[PDB]
Amino acid sequence: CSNLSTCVLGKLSQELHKLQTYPRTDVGAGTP
Numbered sequence: 001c002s003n004l005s006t007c008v009l010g011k012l013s014q015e016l017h018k019l020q021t022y023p024r025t026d027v028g029a030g031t032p
């Protein structure tokens with residue numbers, strides 16, 4: 001990711017989707 005802006009918000013949004021939908025079933029959280 002050249003962005004680290006559009007991309008980082010995308011990854012944070014994806015992380016939030018996963019942990020909300022399911023408690024814990026391989027949450028992404030690739031957000032250093």
Ligand SMILES: *[C@@H]1O[C@H](CO)[C@@H](O[C@@H]2O[C@H](CO)[C@@H](O[C@@H]3O[C@H](CO[C@H]4O[C@H](CO[C@H]5O[C@H](CO)[C@@H](O)[C@H](O)[C@@H]5O)[C@@H](O)[C@H](O[C@H]5O[C@H](CO)[C@@H](O)[C@H](O)[C@@H]5O)[C@@H]4O)[C@@H](O)[C@H](O[C@H]4O[C@H](CO)[C@@H](O)[C@H](O)[C@@H]4O[C@H]4O[C@H](CO)[C@@H](O)[C@H](O)[C@@H]4O)[C@@H]3O)[C@H](O)[C@H]2NC(C)=O)[C@H](O)[C@H]1NC(C)=O
Nearest residue numbers: 001002003004005006007008009010011012013014030031
């Ligand atoms: C996360 O990552 C993603 C990755 O995708 C990022 O998305 C991408 O982001 C970039 C950068 O913003 C985008 O680039 C864009 O590039 C165009 C290039 O020009 C196009 O539009 C022209 C419009 O007309 C202008 O030019 C004519 C001719 O000189 C003038 O008469 C007009 O008045 C305008 O100035 C067009 O002319 C170009 O060519 C076409 O038309 C001509 C003329 O008819 C033909 O000859 C050609 O053949 C052809 O048909 C071309 O289509 C920029 O225009 C975009 O916006 C910049 O320029 C605008 C106009 O000046 C200005 O209003 C904007 O503010 C902006 O200006 C900034 O950037 C300029 C370019 O570097 C600088 O010169 C300027 O100083 C200023 O810094 C835009 O830059 C990508 O499209 C976009 N998507 C993809 C898929 O790549 C995303 O942004 C990232 N997000 C974050 C948060 O990090």
